[PDB]
Every structure is written in structure tokens, then in C-alpha cells.
Design a protein around this ligand. Structure first.
Ligand SMILES: *C(=O)CCCCCCCCCCCCC
Lengths: 40, 204
């Protein structure tokens, strides 16, 4: 089971070994326009 | 008229930090500001609350021309006398009482909601609605604080991957969706500061 609270969110990136958050598809791997990832 | 349905148009939106240097001196930093390609809405349903009243349910109820996705690149480069605020301005041909519901989400789950009721002011043939200097909720203040204290920009973007905001503007009496805006964020790396791109949300 995975946590969604604020501390867990930041801990997951700061200490990836102890990350306990839902796993998701990164936006860059999704079917989205190029302009979504390149700023104007 | 980018972020505009048939009934309502958002002309301005910004989130900012204002600091009072002294009684007569103020410094303001914009995190994001607004002052169209299509995105398949199915690609983003997982990032917002679902079930009744959720993004899918709202989109299906329509109108489809009220639904937008904004990608912000946020400017986080900024320093007792601090005010974190949000402002926005809307215009309509109709005199309505409108409600702005703003939901902050983590992994598609609502963590906090801010709700405001806004009344019209007649302005040169049309009606104007303004949310002026609304206090940014503590969650968002704390989130910005934690983001800024991350050692690396890639870490900030990693956190933001699962952070979204959903703004639903409704006619209070009829419950018609006037505007529904899904917000996605990355950190700005540009010399020009905060940037954005606005997309139409479409069924497929
Ligand atoms: C609290 O009540 C929720 C209100 C949220 C208002 C939305 C403001 C957008 C914040 C942009 C700051 C950038 C953070 C990466």
C-alpha cells in the first residue's frame, strides 16, 4: 500500500530507496504534443 | 480568447509572492501567469479525481468547449511580511453568480479544495468577474517551500509529475460548467521566467 501525503511525496524523490508512493507513467512517455514538453 | 467557452473567458490568472520591504515598498514575484492544440483527455484522467463530479464525469456532461489543459513552467527563483496570493479575471456576456472551485491533487487524489463565489460587475457591454488577491492555502505555501528546498531541478520536476490542480468554474444556480481547467507543472529553466501552453481537451 502506498502513501499520497506531502512528506511521502518529497521523501520518494529525496530518498528513492525508501520511496512508498504510487507508480505512474511519466508524462514524457504519454501520447502528448511536442509543445507539452518544449516551452515557447 | 484562449481559455474561453461560449459563456465565460479567463483573461488573467496568476499566482505570486508579495513581500513588503517597508510601508511604501512592495516586491512581487509571479510564479505563473496568464495574461490551440488538442490533448486527448483520456491521457490525463488518472491525474485528476474521478467518480461523480470528477473530470471524466464533468467532460461527459459538457459542453466540450469549456475544457482546457494548461501546462505551466513555474518560476521558483525568489526569496514576517510575506503574502502568497492568487488572482484571476473573467468576462462574460451574461450576468451570473459564479462559483470557482479549485482542487489541488496528488496522484489524482484531492488533497485540498478552495471555493469562491463571485458576483458580476458591468463593464463596457460585458460583465466582469474578479478574484483579487485570494490567499494561497497553507498546503500550497508548504508545497512551494518544500519544492524550493530540493537540491536539484530534476527532483522538483519529479515531485511535480504527480501534482495537479483542477479549476472548475460553474454557474451557481444552473450548475453549468463555464470553464474547467486542468493544470500541469514543470519548473522553468528559461531566462524569460514563467512560461505556459494552453491546450483544448478533446474526447479522443
Ligand atoms: C489552496 O487552497 C489551493 C489553492 C491553489 C490555487 C492555485 C495557484 C497555483 C499555484 C502555482 C504555484 C506553482 C507551484 C509549483
Amino acid at each position: 500500500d502506498s502513501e499520497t501525503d506531502l512528506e511521502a511525496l518529497f521523501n520518494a524523490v529525496m530518498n528513492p530507496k525508501t520511496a512508498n508512493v504510487p507508480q505512474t507513467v511519466p508524462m514524457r512517455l504519454r501520447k502528448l504534443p511536442d509543445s507539452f514538453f518544449k516551452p515557447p | 480568447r484562449s481559455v474561453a467557452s461560449s459563456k465565460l473567458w479567463m483573461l488573467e490568472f496568476s499566482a505570486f509572492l508579495e513581500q513588503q520591504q517597508d510601508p511604501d515598498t512592495y516586491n512581487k514575484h509571479l510564479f505563473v501567469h496568464i495574461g490551440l492544440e488538442a490533448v486527448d483527455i483520456r491521457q490525463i484522467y488518472d491525474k485528476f479525481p474521478e467518480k461523480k463530479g470528477g473530470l471524466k464525469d464533468l467532460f461527459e456532461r459538457g459542453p466540450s468547449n469549456a475544457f482546457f489543459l494548461v501546462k505551466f513552467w513555474a518560476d521558483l527563483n525568489t526569496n514576517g511580511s510575506s503574502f502568497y496570493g492568487v488572482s484571476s479575471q473573467y468576462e462574460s456576456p451574461e450576468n451570473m453568480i459564479i462559483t470557482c472551485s479549485t482542487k489541488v491533487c496528488s496522484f489524482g487524489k484531492q488533497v485540498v479544495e478552495k471555493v469562491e463565489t463571485e458576483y458580476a460587475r458591468y463593464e463596457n457591454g460585458h460583465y466582469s468577474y474578479r478574484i483579487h488577491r485570494s490567499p494561497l492555502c497553507e498546503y500550497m505555501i508548504n508545497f512551494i517551500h518544500k519544492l524550493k528546498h530540493l537540491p536539484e531541478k530534476y527532483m522538483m520536476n519529479s515531485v511535480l509529475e504527480n501534482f495537479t490542480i483542477l479549476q472548475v468554474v460553474t454557474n451557481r444556480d444552473t450548475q453549468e460548467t463555464l470553464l474547467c481547467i486542468a493544470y500541469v507543472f514543470e519548473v522553468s529553466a528559461s531566462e524569460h521566467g514563467a512560461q505556459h501552453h494552453i491546450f483544448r481537451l478533446v474526447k479522443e
